[PDB]
Design a protein around this ligand. Structure first.
Ligand SMILES: [Cu+2]
Ligand SMILES: [Cu+2]
Ligand SMILES: [Cu+2]
Ligand SMILES: [Cu+2]
Lengths: 661, 310, 316
């Protein structure tokens, strides 16, 4: 019905009161729905903005639960799901929206609440409700860039957008260029990774992944998704693999983990963002800042660094011991199958953790500590830095250090698992004899990258700005389209089903040697995974870059697994102008073993498939390379079985700005 | 825990120490006639789950096992007046009504039913082979429960219905300590109560303890025709008991019906009102009761006749 | 258990594993100036129970230790509405009255007292040696508590009186989570309530937390320190009283009750089944947020104002 489309109007201009009218519509709000500030002159206002409005949406006055808890958070305050107190507020609001039986009462509750609670919080609470109710399914939620551009764009543009919109008539408005590589100069070598850290795409993917796989609320409210623990491990693990790749393409070494929390943090980061909702800017972190004990009475944070250290010490112990202990005192074993999944829930701290109280909230609390170095006891009445919000966390370099550490802990478990036997990763009969890649107007086995401007309408997000269009020009990494071509022999006499698993890693190290397996296995980034039917004899398989199951289309972002989806333009590492050498790897596994018997029509970030009960692959995530090598194996070229193939690829960057055509 | 220990499920926290007590008992009892296999004979009826309940010794062995469980339950602290009170809710009466029968009166009798055993008759000329079973049956009835809200808001509640004998074998009004162990669950269902007072009705065939005729003949389902005890021709006196508990506490947030897959839909212990000993001062059912509970004298009449199914 | 573990009393169920944590801390803190004895110096003030409280670090170390205990208390299940309701009993008000002072107002000041230190002065010419101590003192007061029975039978009850700050350091009305830890016990005594209405009166000097002047100088908390100092401009404080059901709280026991320095409690058992700090030792039940909605009928809150006056009264 219309109702579904009417809720989407709530996302329009989050700080403009709901009675001001969005798009070609306006709400006919009761007077008991008006805010205390505006209610005493409501008649004069409803009248003032009634003009020029096409359609008028009625709203029935309903009961409305107590909204005390939702309203506890200030309107001009920041909102983060990492902060313990905010979690309880959001989870309570989500509960209200979730608890409105009808799609009409949801509209009424929403319209009332919208102008009383924190915009950032409202957006989250609504997003979660809509995505996980049954009546509001397949509903296309507006990109959070368009509703909250302040979390994605240098603050400098805002006063230009205000100028342009006020001075120049519609239609003659120039697109606003969004600054790139703007957070640091060339004295900071970290500034080179702007195109990854600060890319709109990857920040959206991260935000959305945490939307569909929260760690707190209610198991039926989306917490208990199949293998979400392993997902949490793998997704974040692939972020760093991809980051470490991009590092090598900018003449840098692999990211160093956060060894220990007492030693200073070398790399500072000033994000240059200004929250229009908080009306303040996000604080920066200076060079050689040190983590400090938190005492944020307001936020309900009373955590010492030693608490964090204690959690880590215990988690390490469990991993080495090989088992954990639940609240009850019983032992649960970190086996080959469920071990990683358990550990994930323990480390992030999802309510699925078998003993939160003992093993703590290690990942999340780390994000808070790192974001509050500048004001840990709240004496300066400052908010958290960028690492305190999932929406912005990836912008800071320290993210990769903290997430690098966390990964090492997971690794400590993976190296305990028994090596995959020759048998286990052989496909009797199947042999892959070669894989290549071809781009239009480019040699074989050669990928190209470059810069590309794209346009986004930030109009819905620009509160109290003259109506009209406001196009912004993003510059971002892009790759030329390509396709894989894989030569597979059957030699069986029957149609064989198989999973094609495609990863890509660097060929050599920074010291110039052909990489060993032990090293290289952790640098393999997943590029594709798809099902294929093989006829007896010979088969030529072809697959386009844009068919990738790791990636989601351009259109979805603007308008690396099992979440929102990884941005398409970020599929290929940057490489070098002189060319960067890389090993392309493919494996065909026996789909009969890997198959997950299940019924699905497949579903999006709202690639499709992962919203249905189960995850569509029985094998571990990162399957060929998640475990240590079997005896005798030393490098990729002798790890290989017949049903695998390696290929030298060369990644060339070109510093030019291509159009979209 | 104790359950997994006693039956011996692989979930037992130490099978080797606490053994396979229930199961091994079934084997011992089934092999008294040939324990060393010298007579090349198989196990008696107690050795197969399919047939074990036919033997009277089943109830003796299972009676013992129950006493062991009880030994744990009597260690648990009594439910406090507070714990089984529902602030605001008051049950003022419960009755039962069958068509063509006085109030608060249940009837039973015999009834023949038919079953096609054709698929099971190996090397028998094909065709139909109907068998006539005679089995206990009860006349349909319905409960009628009078509940007052006195809160100002819609209250959710669990209706928990048990039935026990009224007196003992010696003819005296039973004490709680005794009677609590003889209460058989009759129904458990969720109900929404509107402010003021509401008159709730529930049919016998809606019971959550039972599964329909159709399933049997054509936890996981007690036969419907066995829902009511037989009673006597002269009438058997019985206490019908109902409790309305606060569903908000008892609720199990989750997406006879279908208890396989996920969780069991009640946070309270199984047999919840009566699983534990009485709190101080309590002595019989009629002073165990809280406002949100009600007792009713029922009379169970058997009639030795073979009725139809119309 | 935890107490015996943390202080390390031979009652600790495993001294060897959980150590002598509190005591060893006192020694570490007292020996920072000479930890290897190279300077042949003795321990500072934190190394002796007699003097430990003089040092500010005492309160930091003892503050830490308390946080560890708290970590256990927050695991315990919240007291249910039921558990701290007294069916029938309702407290409708509590006030305090000092002679020559408004209602609900406590006063403090300085006061010199005299002590004969003659027996302690070795190799000093015999005679008297009086010393003048200046110390905080409060004007005498009394509580007046209005309790309704509405039962038809004599009800026994424990009167439990605590006092906390009203607001925080920033001047906002304190939340429970915060305020529960700042409640100081002021009195706890047994009372018999007649059907209908009862006016209970209790003097400050009858306090079961305190011991008289005469006992200390000429084991319990000093009487003159019963009331916080407050400010000259007045310090706002919430006075709280609870009447619990003594039948549940009762400890069947035979007791001597004669100045075995406070009645005494040298008899085997401690005279209250409830946990120490009982109303506020545990976290709030769901929905509760501040004191004024934590309250049950059998409790009462009252705004008190604590006024200090910088003057020296005599001892009388
Ligand atoms: Cu994340
Ligand atoms: Cu993170
Ligand atoms: Cu059995
Ligand atoms: Cu001490």
């Amino acid at each position: 019905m219309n109702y579904k489309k009417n809720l989407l109007l709530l996302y329009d201009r989050p700080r403009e009161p709901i009675f001001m009218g969005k798009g070609k519509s306006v709400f006919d709000v009761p007077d008991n729905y008006l805010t205390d500030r505006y209610r005493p002159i409501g008649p004069e206002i409803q009248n003032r903005f009634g003009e020029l409005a096409e359609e008028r949406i009625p709203v029935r006055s309903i009961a409305l639960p107590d909204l005390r808890i939702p309203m506890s958070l200030g309107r001009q305050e920041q909102f983060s799901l990492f902060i313990p107190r905010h979690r309880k507020i959001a989870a309570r609001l989500i509960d209200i929206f979730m608890g409105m039986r009808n799609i009409e009462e949801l509209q009424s509750c929403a319209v009332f609440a919208r102008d009383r609670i924190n915009p950032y919080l409202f957006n989250y609470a609504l997003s979660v409700a809509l995505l996980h109710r049954r009546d509001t399914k397949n509903l296309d939620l507006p990109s959070v860039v368009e509703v909250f551009p302040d979390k994605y764009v240098d603050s400098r543009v805002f006063e230009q957008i205000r100028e342009e919109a006020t001075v120049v008539p519609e239609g003659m408005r120039m697109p606003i260029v969004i600054p790139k590589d703007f957070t640091a100069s060339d004295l900071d070598e970290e500034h080179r990774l702007w195109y990854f850290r600060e890319d709109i795409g990857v920040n959206l993917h991260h935000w959305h992944w945490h939307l569909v796989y929260p760690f707190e609320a209610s198991n039926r409210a989306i917490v208990d998704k199949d293998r979400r623990g392993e997902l949490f491990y793998y997704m974040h693990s692939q972020l760093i693999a991809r980051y470490n790749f991009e590092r090598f393409c900018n003449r840098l070494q692999r990211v160093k983990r956060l060894n220990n929390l007492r030693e200073p943090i070398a790399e500072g980061y000033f994000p240059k963002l200004d929250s229009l909702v908080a009306s303040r800017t996000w604080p920066g972190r200076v060079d050689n800042a040190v983590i400090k004990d938190l005492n944020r009475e307001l936020d309900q944070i009373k955590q010492d660094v030693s608490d964090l250290e204690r959690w880590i010490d215990r988690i390490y112990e469990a991993v080495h011991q090989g088992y954990v202990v639940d609240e009850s005192g019983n032992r649960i074993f970190l086996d080959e199958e469920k071990g990683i999944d358990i550990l994930g829930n323990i480390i992030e701290s999802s309510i699925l953790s078998p003993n939160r109280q003992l093993y703590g909230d290690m990942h999340n609390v780390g994000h808070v500590f790192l974001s509050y170095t500048h004001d840990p006891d709240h004496r300066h009445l400052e908010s958290f830095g960028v690492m305190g919000d999932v929406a912005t966390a990836m912008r800071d370099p320290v993210f990769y250090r903290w997430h690098s550490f966390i990964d090492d802990i997971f690794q400590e478990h993976k190296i305990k698992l028994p090596a995959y036997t020759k048998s286990q990763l052989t496909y009797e009969g199947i042999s892959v004899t070669g894989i290549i890649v071809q781009s239009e107007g480019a040699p074989v086995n050669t990928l190209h990258t470059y810069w590309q401007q794209s346009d986004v309408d930030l109009s819905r997000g620009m509160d109290f700005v003259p109506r009209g269009n406001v196009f912004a020009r993003f510059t971002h990494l892009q790759h030329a389209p390509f396709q894989y071509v894989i030569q597979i022999d059957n030699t069986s006499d029957a149609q064989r089903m198989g999973f094609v698993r495609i990863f890509m890693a660097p060929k050599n190290d920074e010291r110039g040697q052909p990489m060993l397996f032990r090293d290289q296995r952790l640098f393999m980034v997943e590029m594709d995974k798809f099902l294929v039917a093989l006829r007896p004899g010979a088969n030529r398989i072809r697959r386009r870059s844009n068919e990738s199951t790791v990636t989601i289309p351009f259109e979805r972002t603007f308008r690396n697994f099992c979440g929102c989806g990884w941005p398409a333009h970020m599929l290929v590492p940057k490489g070098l102008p002189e060319g960067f050498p890389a090993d392309l790897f493919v494996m065909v596994s026996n789909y009969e073993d890997d198959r997950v018997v299940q019924d699905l029509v497949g579903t999006c970030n709202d690639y499709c498939g992962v919203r249905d009960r189960l995850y569509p692959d029985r094998k571990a995530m990162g399957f060929p390379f998640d475990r240590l090598a079997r005896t005798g194996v030393d490098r990729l070229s002798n790890f290989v079985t017949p049903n695998m193939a390696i290929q030298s690829v060369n990644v060339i960057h070109i510093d030019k700005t291509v159009p979209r055509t």
